[PDB]
Amino acid sequence: EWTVDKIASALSVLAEEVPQNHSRLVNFLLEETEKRAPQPRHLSKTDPFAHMKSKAIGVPTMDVKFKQHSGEYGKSRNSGRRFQYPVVCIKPDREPVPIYYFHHAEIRKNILALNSQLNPRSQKIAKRAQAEYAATLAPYLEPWLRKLNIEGCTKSNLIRFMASQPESDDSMTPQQKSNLLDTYSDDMGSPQAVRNASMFTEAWDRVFNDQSKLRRVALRDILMLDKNVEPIFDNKRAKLMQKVIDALGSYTTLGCLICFSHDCEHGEIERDNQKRCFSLEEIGGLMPSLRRKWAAQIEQHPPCRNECYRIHGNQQVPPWSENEVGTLEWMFATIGYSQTLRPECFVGAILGRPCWDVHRKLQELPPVEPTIPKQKSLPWYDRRKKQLMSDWADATITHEHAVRELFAPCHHDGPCTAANGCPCASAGTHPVLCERFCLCTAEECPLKFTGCACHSSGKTCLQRQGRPCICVQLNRECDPTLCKGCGARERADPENAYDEVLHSTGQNVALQRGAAKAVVLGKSQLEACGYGLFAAEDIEEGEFVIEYTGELISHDEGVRREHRRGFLFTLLEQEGIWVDAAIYGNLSRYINHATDGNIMPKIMYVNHEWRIKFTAIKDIKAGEELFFNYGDNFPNLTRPLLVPKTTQPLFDPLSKVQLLPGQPLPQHPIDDSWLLLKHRDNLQDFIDLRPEEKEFLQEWDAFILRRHISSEQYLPRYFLRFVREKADWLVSKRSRGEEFSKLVATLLARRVLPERVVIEATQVLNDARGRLRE
Amino acid sequence: AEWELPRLRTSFIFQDDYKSQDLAEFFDVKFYPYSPPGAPPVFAATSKKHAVICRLTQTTDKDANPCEIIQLIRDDGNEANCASCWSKDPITDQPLLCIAGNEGNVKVYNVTEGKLYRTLVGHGGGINDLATSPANPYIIASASDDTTIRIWSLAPEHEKQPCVCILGGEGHSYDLLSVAFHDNGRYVLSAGHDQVINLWALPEFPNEHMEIPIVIYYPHFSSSEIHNNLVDCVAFYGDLILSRACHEDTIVLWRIEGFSSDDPIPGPLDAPTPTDMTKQTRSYFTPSRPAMFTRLAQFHTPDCGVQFFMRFRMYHVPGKHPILAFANAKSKTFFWDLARFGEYARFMADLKEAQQSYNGRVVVVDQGQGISLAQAQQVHGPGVGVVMKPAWLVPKGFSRETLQAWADMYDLSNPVGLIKAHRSLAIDGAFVGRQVGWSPEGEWCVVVGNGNRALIYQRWGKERGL
């Protein structure tokens, strides 16, 4: 039977093995390192200096005074001798490149930055000391408990004691003391077991948390490192119909509406680097999107080669796991009331089961209400003629990106009016049009954007045409899906970027095409500037030159960064987003300022991204340097392609080697591996996700991110390439196909995957398994 | 003889060459590491404008000068220099000296014939440190104000584009001061004004032209927590780390949890990325939640004050004792012999064993005499305990002040302790030390610092009878 003092006595005796083991370990590692001392390598066979005698003496000449020393004192022997020496002068054959800070890496598209810490000093120092000691002592707590063997003095019971103590208020949280006492519970056992745990805790803090010191740690500090306590204090969490909803919640929470990845550059970062994905959850989760898919369905081929239910539909088939009933439920809900596609075939290939089997477990949906309250058209925008009229530049702020705040696209149930809380009509100073991701249909809603109306066998969708181009008026590029006359479907596809004959016809998609003009880093013609950007090919006035890409950051991160560094481009002034190209960007970060520029930036809306495009305002000959007038864009928040002949030295962007007039211009493919790795690890860091979802999420994300999709026009093609290149991999493990099956499920729920590709993937997966059957 | 520490033998002062009348400094010294074993050792001392190259020859005369200056090179450009390293011509095997400074270019000098071998261009700011790889003498690493490390190759296949690798990304965010190679030549440490120490894993480099250098975005270990100030010097000691920061007056011996140079070299996609912006340490190597590094020992280095860019050097050689050397900012040169720690702990063990195995009747006897444990046992027979005490343990049974003196120099039981220098040699006049360098066979130790002064220390001399 113990006291706090007899316990503090025994912890004192047990604690003196800590320095002993330390000395043992340091001595061991020192002895080990000495033994494996490295032999000096690459010795020459001969003393290369052997032939050289002292050089002491119109040659440049320099002095050296030598002193000699002896005795333990180091006292001299005299004032010392002086000698003069000839000096060999060697000039260098090359100039340094212009000044720069950081390695400048290229990125194809803007990336979303996290907020960084700005790194009282004494509290920082003291916490580090305490942390280092907590790690020293943690390995000892359980061997010592074992050795003392005081009833109720177990690691778990000391964790329970801590959670019940008055410091559970300043340290802990709703759900923090909840799920602590979920894994552990409250009961500490006998009345004497609770007394022991509390006397122990106090003896520990008396022995090791001596407030006189810097090397000091509370028991609480050590218990917090426990692998079962630590997850409770880690804020990296990703989160009949309620069956499906919960099955797809990973995909409806993480999957991006713009680019279809689950870790991408879209969405919002909060002050604590919690991220709201731009996902189905920002527009109401699964249900509003799905109840609408059905409502469109009610208001309206060949067999699978896996023993089609269409022909068969005995016994002798294995029992069904609940994992694989769910798999058929959620493919049944999100295919819904289809005519051209049924679950059985596709479930049949997701699970290794015959198509007739899933039909006799299937054979063995909430009602959908049909209303269209007819709204009067706004006088400033006809969506059927796709045209704006009269005072339109005053009624809306759809084109004034600087004044616009971002909102979740509307997902209400009625008309898009202030009365129903529609953000589009009413959140801003004025109405903005509803976009691709709003659940209205430009059929219900007069505010819906319908694309432009241009068609021309020549060039169209130009900066000024008889009827203007509504997309150009709204300062946006054309939508590959809405703008069906201009050729946007083919010209915004990056696979046609260098089809020069395609792009000589049909002109407002330069950012999505992704082809910049040929340009080249060099030393700027301007005194007091370092680097500049030089055109490498002739650019005609009006042509798009390049995009300003970089890290997207918020106002306060921008401030933190201007401090930390002792050039932050404004993208959205009122929302407070800036593009920072100090490290990540492209060659447009090197364009210099001139009041009389030859290019000009414009903020463009591009399929629910905002982006900075540079356009020529004069003819620019190859070799000319590019300037634009900075203006307010940079606030203080606090025919082979050839190196042109130019007066100024030019550089490879990476090697900083100097380019020679007329050799081939270096076009280096963009290195994105380091960027995939960050996104792979951001998914891995979620505590909310099982290993089997992580594995598939990370495999899809690695594929789809390299494609930078901005538009659902191109998803079905890349979705097909994924199932082809990965079908061998998807039928290997049963976890993988079921995860696949949820992705497909939530893409169907958004009507974003045509079912002509779902029946096609059913083929590739049945085939893939037929070749696995070896 | 093996226990001998150095003593001052020669000092010289090189004429002021950054004139404003006496602020000139020697910033680097390095002995040539590629001479056949036993050749007379040669070293280069780098001032702001000159490379002083001197041969050291042991003497029998206490008053002879062992030092002969065989070559003297001036950088005729506008640069001020502060970093050097050695390499070799890949075709001829002649010594090359690499010199680097504030214009951002590495000059490579053919020093036996007073010509420029070539220039390495590409850094966007001043270079503060150079290091040759122990595994390949044609591979040099440079640490720059521009935040990056560049890896250069003098091998013939890379003459048209010699930067084979840039260590960039967001590992460092201010000027780097220190770069160091592991012995295997694939692990590189970097440190600077941002207080971050980084460990990078270099790829194998193709033995053919590279139009661009490999770029590495993520170090495999990274921490700003080992020090609380700017880090100005870093080095491997085998697999262990030695490092130093301004205002701390220590050299920290520490290790990375789970790092062994006997495991396979991780690739670049094994690196840890910064998914958590509040974590100040991340590591690929981590084997309840453990430390990612652990402090081992702290060599006490008093009176550096606010001076930074002061560098230490360990002598680490098969079959000789490891010696850490460092000169502070008040004119003192400190030495530690790392093999005294084991012999002291071994001595204190035999002492405490025998003070219980004989109830205190223990006579302690010096080694380094003609007297064995066997001869000394004969003098009192099996009645008494005889324990052999290292000759270099000098008193200040044993006194309390003697035990505290010995514990201060040799006890490795406190990772936040301060291990006193084993020898502490005073320097005449005001002297801030910048760099230390050892001869191949370790009989010479050269310390260069301000006033363009070099202090030359010897041990194992041949002097006799003035």
Ligand SMILES: CC[C@H](C)n1cc(C)c2c(C(=O)NCc3c(C)cc(C)[nH]c3=O)cc(-c3ccc(N4CCNCC4)nc3)cc21
């Ligand atoms: C961290 C410090 C500060 C915030 N910072 C950040 C960066 C990216 C950067 C750079 C740099 O990466 N530039 C390349 C470059 C770009 C990116 C764009 C254009 C149009 N043009 C360019 O060159 C350079 C300098 C700097 C300092 C002193 C200096 N002088 C001093 C006395 N006179 C001689 C030289 N010159 C340049 C600072 C930088």
Ligand SMILES: [Zn+2]
């Ligand atoms: Zn996205």
Ligand SMILES: [Zn+2]
């Ligand atoms: Zn079928």
Ligand SMILES: [Zn+2]
């Ligand atoms: Zn609405």
Ligand SMILES: [Zn+2]
């Ligand atoms: Zn809307």
Ligand SMILES: [Zn+2]
């Ligand atoms: Zn609407």
Ligand SMILES: [Zn+2]
């Ligand atoms: Zn148009």
Ligand SMILES: [Zn+2]
């Ligand atoms: Zn359009």
Ligand SMILES: [Zn+2]
């Ligand atoms: Zn168009």
